[PDB]
């Protein structure tokens, strides 16, 4: 009966008027683009009809792949579409995401991360497991999706049986059409109700203050029943905003209606992410409208439909990943959104009934200053993990490979340089066996190299734990109200040689205290990161076991225990090293960037040479997760990089 | 020589010097250096390093004495030797609050709060309590006192009063009045306690007599504020004393 009630709802989606037209294009054409606004039914209805196509084909049942850029999106829509097909999740409908695979030999529709299908492509280059592959929400132009577009453009020349469907929510289809050999376009019209677009008369000076004020005013003064969507840039900013919105409504007294604030970000567990599908609170007995406000990152910008939303609040910002290849820095920065994003944001209002979008900037600024399209992630990311995946795909010509928006050649030079000096490439540039193993790890190349090479330093059990703690959110919960108690608990685990060994101490103590939720609270340790780290470690070890990489430990009483770990770190991060200059600042190797130790380190002093996991570009340059290294290890472990003929004087 | 040259490193050098003497087989000389270290140290940070190293040394020799007495057969002096080292380790941990407090007193002898905490550790041991009051009165400069000096005097008199040694407490109060404290309010509060003591014991005529001497005018018509005058002289104006 639940299936039939889902069926009644799904038949009203805009795509269903185009099912026959969809099927007509899909059978006759190899590639095509499908454009439809968010909520038209794309992610839920289109792969089910591909299952209908793939079930009627004769022979062995190949699956349907549908990519999702976002882990949170991929899991939740897989659950939803299992409910739409009246099957159990992980049976005929499953999901596969980075560090978590919920699939089986029955899986004929798998919603997956881009960076897992691309990794499956590294092991199945023609993607023979799938008869239809669906590139969904491709207007986000994520780093692994852009690679998958080119891989499928190769495979379609070799596999006339594979169908490729590129799904978008933006009018930038012309780029997607021309790139897939002038393939057809299926445009699904909106059935979004009208969205009124409001602008401020002048530009607001504090967009966070403006965001909080606009959220409260809508809740008190708007007579339409409806949920709120506040867009913000990330976790820490949402958490302070959620505290502020709480205080500023609590001071308004009992007459204001109840507001249901729900965070939605990627580091939340699945059970807490699933809470967004709960109904809004009811209207109070005094007539005050009960509303839900979802205060989300850009994970809610695509793939998701929150029913009942009427009022959208758009500050216009998000966090984007940026890479600066001239200085080899990767960072997350807050950037302005595109007009395309701002239209998609506004079109969330019109989903359940007519609605309003309150843009906190002038209408003049909207016309002339906002960018038309969002920049592709490949134009702003380190290609080192991608080039490692690309070389594993048999893509040798990285210069003339058909990227839809090609990266800067210098950025490609940095990806080749990084892999050459790591001995993942030789001096001719071919992919070594070491690189081929590194690509299979769902890690950055520095992290992948460090896990593999640590086997020879007899400390691969510890480095795998460090890498897992680095592949997950930072493990020290440091609440603003509780900093003193959190630091004093953190200093119980602080290792003198730095953060990597401090993460090791936290992880060992976590495993020694039998994964205790209470112990995590009492020591301000992120239980969810640690369970994710344990999940990360148990799967990377299964990759290590697959490549026979020996899990080794050094004697804990030996002086060389921590020293060997510190040497093993150098094997992957020798490019991410800084020297302590005589004036007490650090200078990064080759790129000569002036940096400081990040204020979350345990290092209270400055070693002459420090290795760092992450460069943190802010109002000052910081290096984060730092460890003391000795300079006589650099010339012995990496002579090609530390050749003093070409190395700058530092 | 290094200990004179490297003035900041001392606790580490003592432990390295003790280590040399451990390897020399002069285990007693290691203990000599660690107590010498504890005596010289003037930070809790250095003290922690010395304490932890000495305890590990004590632990290792206690375990060694247990094993050797079982292997060699227990001579009476050998079994007593083990009991001594344990009791020295019992002394070490019990001395540790007193030593910790003493280190802060090495940093500031004027630290009246640490004097109260020292007496608080001495509790149940009257002679130690009596002596540390006397040491507090001698060491603390009123003009540098962190924590007001009369609070020592009140507790000093109260302890004798709790012991019923009222005439000794009076002598303490008499000595207290001789002190020229940093502020008139310190001496005034003492004069109150002189009165209040007699009120508890209902010696009301003596209370009056004390306050008559307290209020008693200088031959000058002295100001309440003139710091060149003795603190005893200034008390004659005091609001508290007259109101009482």
């Amino acid at each position: 009966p639940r299936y039939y009630d889902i069926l009644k709802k799904r038949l009203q989606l805009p795509v269903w008027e185009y099912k026959d037209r969809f099927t007509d294009i899909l059978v006759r054409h190899q590639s095509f683009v499908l454009v439809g606004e968010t909520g038209s039914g794309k992610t839920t209805q289109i792969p089910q009809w591909c299952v209908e196509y793939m079930r009627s084909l004769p022979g062995p049942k190949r699956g349907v792949a549908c990519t999702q850029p976002r882990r949170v999106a991929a899991m939740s829509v897989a659950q939803r579409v299992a409910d739409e097909m009246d099957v159990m999740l992980g049976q005929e409908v499953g999901y596969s995401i980075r560090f978590e695979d919920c699939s089986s030999a029955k899986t004929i529709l798998k919603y997956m991360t881009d960076g897992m299908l691309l990794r499956e492509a590294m092991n199945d280059p023609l993607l023979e497991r799938y008869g239809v592959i669906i590139l969904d929400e491709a207007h986000e132009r994520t780093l692994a999706t852009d690679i998958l577009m080119g891989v499928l453009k190769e495979v379609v020349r070799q596999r006339s049986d594979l169908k490729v469907i590129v799904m978008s929510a933006t009018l930038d289809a012309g780029k997607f059409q021309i790139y897939f050999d002038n393939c057809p376009l299926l445009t699904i019209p909106g059935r979004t109700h009208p969205v009124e677009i409001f602008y401020t008369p002048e530009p607001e000076r504090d967009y966070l203050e403006a965001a909080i004020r606009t959220v409260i005013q809508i809740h008190m003064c708007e007579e339409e029943e409806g949920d709120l969507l506040l867009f913000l840039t990330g976790q820490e900013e949402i958490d302070e905003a959620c505290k502020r919105i709480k205080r500023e409504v609590d001071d308004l007294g009992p007459e204001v209606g109840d507001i249901k604030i729900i965070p939605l970000y990627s580091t939340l567990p699945p059970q807490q992410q699933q809470r967004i599908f709960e109904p809004p609170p009811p209207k109070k007995q005094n007539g005050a409208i009960g509303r839900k406000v979802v205060v989300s990152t850009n994970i809610a910008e695509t793939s998701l439909t929150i029913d009942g939303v009427v009022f959208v609040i758009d500050p216009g910002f998000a966090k984007q990943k940026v890479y600066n290849p001239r200085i080899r820095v990767e960072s997350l920065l807050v950037t302005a959104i595109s007009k395309a994003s701002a239209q998609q944001r506004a079109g969330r209002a019109g989903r359940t009934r007519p609605g309003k979008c309150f843009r906190l900037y002038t209408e003049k600024a909207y016309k002339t200053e906002m960018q038309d399209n969002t920049y592709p992630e490949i134009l702003r990311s380190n290609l080192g993990s991608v080039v490692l995946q690309l070389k594993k795909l048999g893509i040798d010509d990285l210069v003339h490979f058909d990227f839809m928006d090609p990266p800067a050649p210098e950025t490609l030079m940095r990806a080749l340089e990084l892999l050459n000096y790591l001995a993942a490439l030789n001096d001719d540039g071919d992919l070594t066996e070491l690189g081929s193993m590194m690509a299979e790890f769902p890690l950055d190349p520095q992290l992948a190299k460090m896990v593999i090479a640590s086997c020879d330093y007899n400390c691969s059990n510890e480095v795998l734990s460090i890498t897992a703690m680095l592949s997950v959110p930072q493990c020290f919960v440091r609440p603003t109200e509780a900093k003193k108690a959190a630091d004093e608990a953190k200093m119980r685990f602080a290792h003198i040689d730095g953060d990597h060994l401090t993460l090791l101490n936290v992880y060992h103590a976590f495993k020694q205290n039998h994964e205790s939720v209470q112990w995590c609270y009492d020591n301000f340790i992120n239980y969810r990161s640690l369970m994710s780290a344990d999940n990360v470690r148990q799967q990377l070890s299964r990759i290590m076991d697959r490549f026979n990489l020996p899990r080794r430990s050094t004697d804990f009483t030996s002086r060389d225990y921590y020293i060997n770990i510190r040497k093993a770190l150098v094997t992957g991060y020798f490019m991410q090293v800084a020297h302590l200059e005589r004036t007490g600042h650090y200078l990064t190797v080759k790129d000569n960037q002036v940096v400081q130790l990040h204020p979350s380190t345990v290092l209270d002093h400055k070693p002459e040479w420090v290795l760092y996991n992450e460069f943190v570009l802010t109002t000052k340059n910081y290096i984060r997760t730092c460890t003391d290294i000795k300079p006589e290890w650099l010339v012995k472990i990496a002579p090609q990089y530390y050749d003093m003929s070409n190395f700058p004087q530092c | 020589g290094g200990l004179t040259r490297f003035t900041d490193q001392l606790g580490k050098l003592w432990c390295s010097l003790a280590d040399y003497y451990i390897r020399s087989g002069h285990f007693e000389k290691a203990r000599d250096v660690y107590e010498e270290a504890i005596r010289t140290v003037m930070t809790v940070r250095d003290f922690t390093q010395v304490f932890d190293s000495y305890a590990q040394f004590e632990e290792s020799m206690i375990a060694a004495k247990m094993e050797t007495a079982s292997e060699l057969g227990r001579e009476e002096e050998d079994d007593v030797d083990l009991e001594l080292r344990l009791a020295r380790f019992e002394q070490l941990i019990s001395r540790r609050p007193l030593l910790l407090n003493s280190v802060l007193l090495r940093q500031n002898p004027h630290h009246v709060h640490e004097w109260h905490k020292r007496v608080a550790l001495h509790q149940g041991r009257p002679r130690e309590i009596i002596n540390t009051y006397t040491e507090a009165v001698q060491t603390v400069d009123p003009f540098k006192a962190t924590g007001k000096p009369h609070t020592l005097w009140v507790a000093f008199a109260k302890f004798y009063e709790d012991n019923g040694q009222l005439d000794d407490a009076r002598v303490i109060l008499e000595k207290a009045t001789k002190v020229n404290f940093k502020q008139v309010d310190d001496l005034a509060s003492v004069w109150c306690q002189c009165g209040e003591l007699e009120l508890r014991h209902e010696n009301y005529d003596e209370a009056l007599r004390l306050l008559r001497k307290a209020t008693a005018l200088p031959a000058r018509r002295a100001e309440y504020f003139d710091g060149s005058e003795p603190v005893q002289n200034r008390v004659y104006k005091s609001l508290k004393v007259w109101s009482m």
């Binding site: 209270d604 | 432990c15 451990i22 590990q56």
Partner: peptide
Amino acid sequence: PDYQQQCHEMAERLEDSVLKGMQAA
């Protein structure tokens, strides 16, 4: 830390010192 560096170094060194010390004594 400068202070803690000597703490970790000497903790391992004291155990070596106790081991060689019992042999010498």
